[PDB]
Every structure is written in structure tokens, then in C-alpha cells.
From a paper:
The hemagglutinin (HA) surface glycoprotein promotes viral entry through its receptor binding and membrane fusion functions, and mutations in HA have been shown to modulate the pathogenicity, host range specificity, transmissibility, and pandemic potential of influenza viruses. HA is synthesized as a trimeric HA0 protein that must be activated for membrane fusion by post-translational cleavage into a high-energy HA1/HA2 complex. Upon internalization, the virus is exposed to progressively lower pH values until a threshold is reached that triggers HA to undergo irreversible conformational changes that mediate membrane fusion. Here, we provide biochemical and x-ray crystallographic evidence that naturally occurring amino-acid variations at the interface of the vestigial esterase and fusogenic stalk domains alter HA acid stability for highly pathogenic H5N1 influenza, resulting in a shift in the threshold pH required to activate HA protein structural changes that cause membrane fusion.
To gain insights into the structural basis for altered HA acid stability, we determined the crystal structures of the prefusion forms of the MP and HP HA proteins. One crystal form of the MP HA protein was obtained at pH 8.5, and two crystal forms of the HP HA protein were obtained at pH 6.6, all above the low pH thresholds for conformational changes for the two proteins. Comparing the midpoints of conformational changes, MP HA had a value of pH 5.3 whereas HP HA had a value of 5.7, showing that HP HA is less acid stabile than MP HA. In MP HA, E216 makes a hydrogen bond with neighboring RBD backbone amide R212, although this hydrogen bond is found only in two of the three E216 residues in the HA trimer. The lack of hydrogen bonding by the third E216 could be biologically relevant, helping to destabilize HA, or could be due to a crystallographic artifact. However, the presence of an E216 residue did not seem to have a dominant effect in the context of MP HA, which contains six other mutations and has an overall decreased pH of fusion compared to HP HA. T115 in MP HA forms a hydrogen bond with the backbone carbonyl oxygen of L111, thereby capping and stabilizing the C-terminal end of the 110-helix. We hypothesize that the negatively charged D104 in HP HA forms less favorable interactions with the neighboring L73 at the top of the HA2 coil in the prefusion conformation than does the polar N104 in MP HA. Overall, we suggest that the combination of D104N and I115T mutations found in MP HA promotes the stabilization of the 110-helix and thereby stabilizes the prefusion form of the HA protein, lowering its pH of activation and, consequently, attenuating the virus. Six of the 7 available HA protein sequences from H5N1 viruses sampled in 1999, including the MP 437-10 isolate, contain the N104 and T115 residues that we found to contribute to a reduced HA activation pH and reduced pathogenicity.
Author numbering:
A (entry chain D): 1 to 172
B (entry chain F): 1 to 173
C (entry chain B): 1 to 170
D (entry chain C): 10 to 19, 19A, 20 to 28, 31 to 35, 35A, 36 to 53, 53A, 54 to 82, ...
E (entry chain E), F (entry chain A): 9 to 19, 19A, 20 to 28, 31 to 35, 35A, 36 to 53, 53A, 54 to 82, ...
The structure:
Amino acid sequence: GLFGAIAGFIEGGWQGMVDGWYGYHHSNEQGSGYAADKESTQKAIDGVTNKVNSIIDKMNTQFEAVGREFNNLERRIENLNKKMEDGFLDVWTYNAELLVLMENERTLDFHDSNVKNLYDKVRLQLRDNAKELGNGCFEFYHKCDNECMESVKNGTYDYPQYSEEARLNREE
Amino acid sequence: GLFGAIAGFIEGGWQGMVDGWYGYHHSNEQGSGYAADKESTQKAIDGVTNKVNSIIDKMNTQFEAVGREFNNLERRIENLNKKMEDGFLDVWTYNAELLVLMENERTLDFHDSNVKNLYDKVRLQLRDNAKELGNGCFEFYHKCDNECMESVKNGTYDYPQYSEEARLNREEI
Amino acid sequence: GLFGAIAGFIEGGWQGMVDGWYGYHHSNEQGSGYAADKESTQKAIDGVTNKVNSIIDKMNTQFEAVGREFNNLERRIENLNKKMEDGFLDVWTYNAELLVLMENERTLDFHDSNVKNLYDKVRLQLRDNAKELGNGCFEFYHKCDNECMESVKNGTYDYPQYSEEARLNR
Amino acid sequence: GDQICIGYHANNSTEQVDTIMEKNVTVTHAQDILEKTHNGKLCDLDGVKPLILRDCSVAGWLLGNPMCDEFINVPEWSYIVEKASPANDLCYPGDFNNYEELKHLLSRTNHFEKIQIIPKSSWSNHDASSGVSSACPYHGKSSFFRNVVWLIKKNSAYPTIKRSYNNTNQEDLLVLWGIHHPNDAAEQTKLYQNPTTYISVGTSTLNQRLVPEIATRPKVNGQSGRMEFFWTILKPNDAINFESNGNFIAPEYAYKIVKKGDSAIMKSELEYGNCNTKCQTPMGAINSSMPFHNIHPLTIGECPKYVKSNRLVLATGLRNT
Amino acid sequence: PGDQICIGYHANNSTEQVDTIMEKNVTVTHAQDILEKTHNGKLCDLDGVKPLILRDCSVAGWLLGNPMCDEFINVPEWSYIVEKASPANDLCYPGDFNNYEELKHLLSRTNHFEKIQIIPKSSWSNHDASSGVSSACPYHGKSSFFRNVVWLIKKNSAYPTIKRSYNNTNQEDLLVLWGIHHPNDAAEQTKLYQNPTTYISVGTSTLNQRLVPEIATRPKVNGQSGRMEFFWTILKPNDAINFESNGNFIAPEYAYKIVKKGDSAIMKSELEYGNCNTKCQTPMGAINSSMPFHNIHPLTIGECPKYVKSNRLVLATGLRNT
Amino acid sequence: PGDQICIGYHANNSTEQVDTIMEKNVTVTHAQDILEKTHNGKLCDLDGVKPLILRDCSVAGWLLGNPMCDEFINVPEWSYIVEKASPANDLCYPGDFNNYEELKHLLSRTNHFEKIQIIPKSSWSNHDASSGVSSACPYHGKSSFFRNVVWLIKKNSAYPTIKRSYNNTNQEDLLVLWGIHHPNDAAEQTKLYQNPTTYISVGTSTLNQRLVPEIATRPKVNGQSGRMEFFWTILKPNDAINFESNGNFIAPEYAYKIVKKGDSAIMKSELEYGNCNTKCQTPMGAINSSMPFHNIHPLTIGECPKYVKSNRLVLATGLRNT
Ligand SMILES: *[C@@H]1O[C@H](CO)[C@@H](O)[C@H](O)[C@H]1NC(C)=O
Ligand SMILES: *[C@@H]1O[C@H](CO)[C@@H](O)[C@H](O)[C@H]1NC(C)=O
Ligand SMILES: *[C@@H]1O[C@H](CO)[C@@H](O)[C@H](O)[C@H]1NC(C)=O
């Protein structure tokens, strides 16, 4: 897609992550495990919800057809009436079909963009304390326990704390 | 945002930079300060001005209601008249409101994109000569004087001419 | 542009690539030359083609003006007929003009994004086995023959192959 | 050793959306926003029953076609249902003047109450009993419209009618009357004595004169004669004046407009479905949470918005794997 | 050794908010409101041309010359016409105005009506001109009539056949008005016009009518049991109008030169003259704005922003504020 | 040591420009025009079917049989109808056509009229069917009349009551036309018809009318102070039309079978036949285009592109050019 994350440098989605839309898989000494990122999932839910409500709201004040009748000496205005009603009908059909199409593409890219941003958030926290596999994964040059993993997900990872240990292990 | 920069990897804006929309903060041996990137700012002002104008211009031929009168024997046509005028009025109201909603989104992304492009512009201009701090800042592996600072702001930086002392410090740091 | 690639970090386009929209240029011992990325160009063709068709299809149900006549004691309905037909003409003229405008910008951004994604596909494949010049080019930390240069265009490039040569150079 | 990976959701779903640039894209979560389902029935609207005219037309009902007695007294309605071509319309052939304009008034009405404005027994100088036709039979007996009276000369004379009715009620009044068009000069004298007749009707805003139009005509329902019916709205405190020396079809009953509101005349072949709904179409009732539907453009009540498309699906999740 | 360059973006004290598809009330550094929401609540001149404000008179009242409408006996060029929802002074003597709405429309295509005499009132030698008045049309507590038409009555128990003509020898189209009196009974027909069987015939190059009076008792309106019915025609330069009648004829005296045609309007407003000047006028008040949109009233005249129904329309120009 | 691979995009010698919401006149590398701006300036057949060009005649002139419209005495199947803004050959004898605009609308739902005789001119043995001609309808310097209708005069100072009828036993709907003459005075009434008080009555199973002539004094139009008013009805298969009159009757002679109903149009244009074929026709000329949009004229017939008011509609396919 537009941002290269979904079906891009991350080749596929995870069947094993039922918790949310985006998240992490971590495997340290204390075992592996899937976990959702709550900050970005809630942001996406909120965005998508607002979009849906916005579309419905823009359509609540929309043309309503009324039945009018005419005699055989009123064909011109009957033809005009029909043409007027069918005209708004077509115009509102167009607006709805087009809005749905345009927003669907945007929703798809919105997700793509969130995934990349989540990945960059981790990448910019870790720097050279970890090796960038190139498929959405990071190999730690130091030992990172569950509480350390949580600081990565929390956005509070302490780079200076592990940098010296990472420097030496890397240099080997 | 869509591009991860504004309120993203750059946490907040600067109350101190009043010269434009996007720019730099430098810090070296001879003092620190704020300066705006005039180029990308002007590029953005022109884009936004034109966007505003084309929105206004596209509504230049919208429906204009004309008052008509009918007697008590012309209720069908009076009703046809009202529903058709309200019809176009609702349509154009939708067009106006929807265009502003959609473009407002695209504008915020535009600015986000521009901050991200300016960041990348410096990034590849410095290479390893400097260090990505991950917060929008680069720490130089060498001494960067005021004319070195205005070198990257002007967009004309010498990677090879500095790669000497940079590599030396980087290998030891 | 939105993705900072076309007329961004890649300053210009190549006249020498008549082969497609996006692709590569290689320099080695065997020689130099241009080549288009088949997969990248074909996806962008399908996308654009579909867009053009969606635009036309959605307009097939447009308003059709029909001429009507009135006598000179029917000036109110004549006026109403005129205003309504001009009204729909204007509405559909707006829809067409705006749709073209908006999707043009998306088409331009779409191409920008495809170049950006192609460049990243190469960067992630090569890792530190090459140097990033910052202009769209990669200088290899090992000798890469034409067979090795086709492996990066094809996607299946072997990193634990040239890990040795590139390691000791830095 | 230690690893962290960033990725996204996937699931078993097969739901599909479209974009400008790619059709049939599978996504993990999608939302349908389009109703395609109705119940095929004509229901009550917020507990208020519709008026279902069965085999009677609006004209048949309002004028009192002998075959439409089911509707001589009608309660408050939500909407009105008339067939495309009802059998029971103008039993005696002719026209309803401003008929379409009358139907439009009815669509802004919920409640008619019948009252007597001129008693049938008040015609001492005129025959009020022999104005019946084989064209308007009741059992197999010659009859006529119930709300209106066909006056015939009495004792070889037709004296000038001058009547006035004051609308003492609080409601607007729908008043109906008519003119008979005979087939030849000989019939004129036979029925009405006077050769050159007129009918003058007057309110404070209405001023009209009707003159018979004699012509030679083919039989419709066995009659070469014609009848043309006229109506007006009589405002509270206004009066209506009738003046005629022949061809007059006098009112007896008019309609109090007790409740005005939102209504409709629905064209539908269906009959009552003993149900309740919030939204009604001529094809059936809609019970839905969706914002859009594609059932029929002409609806009444709290309805989703009509659209012509066969599919409308919003993407909510991401591209599935 | 701690030399650094940082990349960032503007922030400020702005509180201005915009909406997007995905988020509401987003604070931004810069914004452009494009919607005008105010007016001065007054009916003004339109580019230095004063409107015609009919006050308590309707169009019919003005054109026929209801005696209560003497303010509008000779009106100067207008930019637009203002009429109330229910004008008090209409047909003082009750009745009908034939094709009234079509005349209203023609009037919205006009800017100036120059009144001219076409049949002088002193010209009726064999008919009583002066005693055709009614309590239904009072002036100063005294029986009067429409000023622009003449209600001719019999003279010395006689109503001779009238044959009058008028040639439009002017350079402009001419609006001409006349009428007919429908009496309440045969006795009133005798007392007013002597002849029991009467007619009015009117012919132009495009017009052909023969009116017969309709004698009938109708409910009292302003004391009157009879009715009057009015007709009008546009007579082109060099065309003539011929009247013939032996009773019930409401003859013209004054007609109207349509001297100027253009974009005019009949505005429905209860408001009165505001002694101001504007380029854009609504029925609720005048607009003075550079905004591309307004939400005051759909029915405007002049050089106006485009009408919309929103409460808010704010465009984002700057970025997301911190 | 210097082995290289570079990522790049296409550039060419294209000068094709597109617009966006933010940047106008962007030079693009591949574009697609979707707007047709061109036409052949001629009126053509629609899919091999020739239109009916009425030239200097009008619909009324054609159908009533104006002597100056003999080219349209028998018309073959048409695709559309072309009429001038001000056809010279309309109602040679002055008057009006009743419900003319409704008739034109019905005409626009028809492709084929076949003319048949319903009342032979020879069948009038007690009326003068030859002297009903006028200097208002000259042909080669001889007084004539409308070809399809008969102006009946008294014979031997007598106009007996007419009782004629016609049953439509054809399979098609029939358009039947007739008229009434309004004389200018009571003298002219007697000279033409003898009887002072006259009527025309017409009745089908749906139609009921009795017409009475309306005498008035009128200016001359084409040398005539008199007027004629024409009427029409559709006669259903197996329905009958009954006429009765004692004067002023303009009797049918020929009627029209509506043999083909379909999509048609009355096109307003000052052009004439161009001897061509097309799938899409405008009043300004024909379109031959694979394009989805055009800006030629809103009123088209046939398989046409969608109309927009734009000057340029160009869609970007390729990318930004260097
Ligand atoms: C989309 O898939 C559906 C499967 O039901 C198929 O019927 C349709 O043809 C497809 N549309 C396109 C454009 O491929
Ligand atoms: C947005 O904020 C405004 C304050 O001006 C408030 O009135 C409105 O309710 C808010 N809307 C939403 C959706 O929160
Ligand atoms: C775009 O440039 C072209 C030159 O052909 C011209 O048609 C157009 O007016 C220019 N428009 C703008 C906005 O510069």
C-alpha cells in the first residue's frame, strides 16, 4: 500500500494476535507471546468510529421524494417532476458510492501508516542497541527482560542505560 | 499524523520559532537559537493559498434560489418548487461541508509530510557524520561552527570534507 | 511531494528508462545500463487503469437535459424549468471537475509512494552490505556481478552470501 | 537471542470492500450500511392504522360511490393506500375537476369527519328522489352518490335555487358539488325544464360560474351523459352560496378537516398486514438500524435514506492476509 | 563535542478549531473562517438605488390604485420590490385578479413603471363617471374607488354602447388594466346599467375576449355581495386595444409604461426601509462581507456570497497546535 | 569497490499539463483527455434515420397544412424534429392553437405520423366547402386555406345543423384537429353563417366540449381582424368523435395515425440538413467521439457522452515530469 508497511516489509498479519489491530511479538528468556499496542489501537478505533459517524451525519439531511400526480394535459410538468426527482436521486447515489470508495482507500492507508509509525517508534527508541532484521523485527544486542520489553512498548526505553553493554557485545 | 513527525517522533512544536512553519534549532560553541526554513515554508504557504482559492473558485457556480409565487390552485407546483430549491441547497451545503472536512484532513497531513521531508533532507545530508537522537535532533560527530550550521540549513553540506574527524570520534564513542 | 522521493531525495527522472515508470540503473565491471522494475510498474498500471474506469463508470448515471416549451402565460414554470436544469448541469460539472482535481493529486502521490517503496525494498535487502549515498544510489561493499545485480531486481538477494567481503572492508 | 517484532492483525473473514483503485479487497472488519430487506406488508405507522381503500378510488370514497359504504365514516389514518386502477371510481361517467390538486391536499391530512350541510329533505321545489342511475347501482337497484344530490324538475318546473351555508365549525371544510352535462337539448327540458341554465358558486375568495356543455357522446357505463365535480375549502366563519336554475348536483355532506399533518397517498396492490412499523414503503415496511436503504424512494415515517445502489460497504479494519 | 541541529515546527497561543473526517475540534496554529454569519437587519438601497417598499399595500393595490395606497401613485425607478406576507390593502372591492402571479413575475423582470393616462375620465359624455364609488373602498371616510380604473354607471336611465380605442404610440411596452362588475341580482343590474343582457369585448392583435357578467349573490366582503374581476394585457408599440361594452365595464384610465427591464425581485419581508446602502440584500437584512459563504437567507439579490446551511465552516491553513 | 545500483523514475519529452487542488499546470509524463470539444457543425441522421427538418414551417403550420408547407404533406418516419426559433410559416389565418405546448411534447414521443382522410371534402352537400379561403393564406397569388381542415360557409343563405361522427377502427391512436372562427362583428357572423347564435360541440368517450364564438373588435394581422382557434384530441382505437355545429366550424378533413411511438425530440436550431450520419446529435452539430464527456451543448439525442460546462478536463495517468 501507500506506506509500505502492511503487506510490504511486514509480509503478513498475525492470526495469533486477537487483542487488537497492531502490536508486538516478544521472545526473551521468559518465553514468547503476542501483545497488542493499546495506544495505537485505540487511536485507530477512535478515528474509524468518527469517520463512520461523520459519513452518516453528512447524509441525515438528504433529498426525500414526494409523490405528485398529473392529468393527461400536464405531461410537460409531469416529465419535469420525474426528471427533478430522479435527478436528486442519482446525485445522492453518486455522493454515497463515491464517499464510501474514497474513504475505504483512506481507511486502508490509515492502517498502513499506523503500522509503520509503530515500527518507527520502536526503531527510534532502540537505535544501535538492537539489530534491524528488516522484516519488522529487532534482535537485541543486550538482555531485555519483561520489564525492559514493557519500557519499549511504554515508550520509555532507557537507551543510555544499555548502550555501553550493547557497544561491547556488538564490537565482538 | 499520517507521516509520524508532527506530534510523532517530534513530540511538540516550538513557541520560540515565529519566523515560519518549519525550521531548525542549532546549538554549538558560539551560541544557540531558532531559524525557520524559508524554502519549505514558502512552498507550503503557496500550496495552502492555492488550495483555499480553488475551493472558493469551485463554488463560483453554485445554486442561487429565486423566490416564486403560486396561488391556492397550484399547491403541487409550489411544493415541487420548494423541494427542488431545498434540494440544491442541501446538495451544495453537503459539497461545501464535505470538501472542507476532507481538505482539512489533507492539510494537516501536508504539514506532517513537510516536517518529515525536511528532517530527511538533513538526515541524508549528514550521513554518519552525525548521530540520530530519535527526537528530531542530530548530534554531530565533529565540531560544527555557525557556518557549518548554515551549511545544512542552506542545503549545501560537505560530507567528505568532514568525514575525517567524524570517523575518528565515532570509532571511539 | 507527500512521500519525498520524486523530485525529493531523487532529484530528477531518467530519459534513458523508456522501459517503464520505475526501475534501476546499475554500474559494475561488466558495464552499465537501465532496467524497469516489472512488478512495480505493472501494479501502478493496474491501479491507474482501474481509477480511470471507476471515474467514468460513476458518471454514467448523469443528468440528461430535455428541451421543454412554454407559452407566455407560463413564465413561472419556464423559469423553474431553466433553473432546475442549469442546477443539475452545474452540480455534475462540479462533481466532474472536483473528482478529476482530487484524484490527479492522489495519482501524483501514488507514483511518489511507489518510488519510495522501491528504494526501501532495495535498502532492506542490502542491509549494511552497501553504502547509502542519499541520492537514490547504493555503493556495494563487495564486487557485485550482473548475476548479483539481477538478484536485487528479482527480490531474492542473498545476504548471508556476501556477509564476509563486506564485513572486513568497514 | 532476545527479539521484538512489530506486526498487525489477521483473521478468518472474507468480507470485501472496493476502492477507486482496487475492487474486491478482503478486509478484517467491514460495516454494511445498506438495507435491502422489507417485510412485504402494509403496516401501522407508530400505532396509527392506514386507510386502505381496497377497490375504491379517492373519488369513489369522497363522492360516495354506492359501492364504497365501507368508507362512509372513516377514522384517523396514518397514510392512504389506493390501487393503481380501482374499480369503484366515477360510477356515473365524467370528471373530477382539480383531482390531482385534491389528492395533494389529502396527503397533508390525517382526519376527515363527515357532516351534513344541506339536508336532502330541504328541497321542497325540487325532485330529490328520482335522480338515480343504473350506472350507479347499489344492490341491482338504481342509485347515486351518497354525499351529493341530483336534483330533477318538480311539476314541470325548476325554480331558482339560492342557498347559503355558514361554516360555524372550527375546522376547514371540504365542500363538493357537481354539474350534469346532458346529451341533447331534449334531455335538458326533460330533466330541468329551463333551456339555458347556469350554476354560480361563491365564497369570500371563490367566484365561479358553471354552464352545461351539451355534446353527442359514446356510452360509458351505459351513459352518454357526463358529470363534472368541483370542490373548495371553506374556511371557519366563511360562507358558501349556491345559485342555480338547472343541472345542479347539490351537496348534502361535506368533510370537517379535523387533523392536518404528514401523510401520503401510496400506490400499492398490497393489503393490510396487521403489523406496526416506524417506516413504510409501498412495497413493505422497514425495520432497520442502517443509514441507507434501496427498497423504494417513496416512504413515510422515520426512514433511512433511499439510494439506488445494490451494495454499500465501509472498510473498518485493514487488509487481510 | 555536543554540537546539535534539531528539526521542528511552529507552535503558538491560537485557540481556533477545525474538524476532519476522523477528528473533531482540532486546535490549529492558523485558520480561515470562510462563512459569514451576520447582517445589519435592515432593508437597504442596492448599489445606490432605493427599493420599492409597499408597506401595507399589495401589488394589486398599487397597480389598480387602492385609495389607501396613494403613497405609490407615481413611483420612481426601483432596484427590488418589498411586499409583506399579508398586505392590508388589496382589492378593497372584493373579487379576482386574473393571472396575478404571472404579472408578479413580469414585475420581477422590471425596474421602472411610468404611469400615463390613456382614457381620460372627463371623456365619458354619455355615461356617469363620478358616482361609481363604494363603501368597500373608502378614502378619507368617504366612498371611493380604484384610482386607475373607472366604474361607469348609466346616465339619465341610459347606458349606450361604448366603442373606444387606444393605440400604443410610445416606444415602450404598455401594461393595460380593466375589469368587469358581477352584480348580486337582476335588480342591481337594472339600477346600475339599465340593460339586462350585457357584455365586454376586448381585442388586440394577440388578445380576444368576450366577458359576460355573472349575476349571483355571494357572501359579503367589505359589505359587498357582488364581485369584481380584473384583467391585464401587455400592449406592444403600435398595437391597438379596442373595447366594446353596454354595461358592467370597469374602464381603464391610467396604464403603465415599462420603461426599464432588468434583474429585479419581489422580496417577502415584514421589515421596513433602513436608510442604508448595500451590495447584497436578504429579506432579513443586508450583508457586507468578503467571505465566500453566508448562512443568513437563501433568497438574496446583488453581489453576494454563496448561501449554505451550516453553522460553521472553518478551513485549516496552519498545522496541529501543541 | 565502486559497484552501484540506483533507484529511479521515468522522464520524457511530454508537455501535457494537469491541475490539482494545490498546484495548477503540473507537467505530467502521461495524461488522458476525457473531454470532447469538437463537432461537425451539421444536422445528420440518427443511426440511418433522417430527421424532420421543418425549415420555414412550424409544427402548427405542418400539422394544420399551411399552404406554404406542402413539402410536409406526407412525412416519412423521423428520428428527431428540427424547428427554427421563429418559423415564418405558422398560422397564416391569425389565431391561436389550444394546448400547443402539450401537443409538441406528445410529438416528441413520436417517430411516425401517417395522414388519413376522415371526412371527405365532397361529403358536404348542404354547406359551401369551396369558398372558405382567405388572402391571409395566399398560394401563387390565389386565396387559399389550411390543407387539412375545411372552413365551411353557408349555402343558399342557410347553415343547417351539422351532425357528423367518425369511429376510429384503425389499430393506432389518431390525432384529430378542428377549429372555430371568431368573426369581428355580428354582420360578418350573418354573412358567413346566417345563424346569429352558434356553437360547435364535440364529444368522445373522454372529451366533452361546446365552443361558442367570441366576437370582438381587433387589429388586422395578415390583413384579417377575424381569428381562428384550433383544438385537438387523441382518438383511441374503437372510440368515436361526434361533431355538431350551426356555424363557425372549421371541420377536420385529414387526421394523423400515430404509427410509431418512441424516443424523439423537438430540437431548436437555425441549421439545416448536412447529409451525414451520427450516433449523437446536438442543435450545433454532431459528435463522433470515444470520449466520456463533452461540452458542446446540453440538449442532445442518441448515444452521447455526458455533458459538462468545463473547458478542459485532463486526467493524470503518469507521474511528475522533469
Ligand atoms: C468481485 O468479486 C465478485 C465475487 O462475488 C465478482 O462477482 C465480481 O465480478 C468481482 N468484481 C470485479 C470488478 O472483479
Ligand atoms: C467540540 O467542542 C465544542 C466547543 O466549542 C463543543 O461545543 C462540541 O460539543 C464539541 N464536539 C465534539 C464532537 O466533541
Ligand atoms: C496554466 O498555463 C497555461 C498555459 O497554457 C494557461 O492555459 C493557464 O492559464 C495557466 N494557468 C495558471 C493558473 O497559471
